[PDB]
Amino acid sequence: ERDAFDTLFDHAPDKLNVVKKTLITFVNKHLNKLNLEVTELETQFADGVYLVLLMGLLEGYFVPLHSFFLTPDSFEQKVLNVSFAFELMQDGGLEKPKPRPEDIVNCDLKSTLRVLYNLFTKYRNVE
């Protein structure tokens, strides 16, 4: 099974470009609160750190930095971080994400963008 996000990612370069553009703006609206900048969606979410921090910010709090692997030393620590971000998503009411947590760690762009897009849809009005 595929959906409209598969269709644009797979077939619509111009629409994909505004999606990416919008996602970079959105993730920085929040991550800039921590003096963090994203420039490259392809890799800067792979280690799970920004994704955890973003999830706290979208729900109005700062996640304790010792509660996840702030400087992950391995594939496994990255996967654990992504899994924790997915847990926070579900705790807040989102359906379990489509992608495996390791898909994000392995820098699958479509997986990364879908996850971020579903956050944007839900949380675009968080200040």
Burial 95-108 (b: 16+ CB within 10 A, else e): eebebebebbbeeb
- Sorted by where each begins, the domain ranges of the chain are 1-127
Q: How far apart are CA 30 and CA 111, in angstroms?
A: 21
Q: How far apart are CA 74 and CA 72, in angstroms?
A: 6
Scanning the structure block, which residue is given the tokens 């994203």? 38
Q: Which two tokens stand for residue 79?
A: 């996967």
The residue type of 74 is S
Resolution of the experimental model in angstroms, please?
Answer: 1.0
Question: 114: helix, coil or strand?
Answer: helix
CATH number 3.40.50.300 is the correct assignment for the domain at 1-127: no
How many C-beta atoms lie closer than 10 Å to residue 71's C-beta?
A: 8
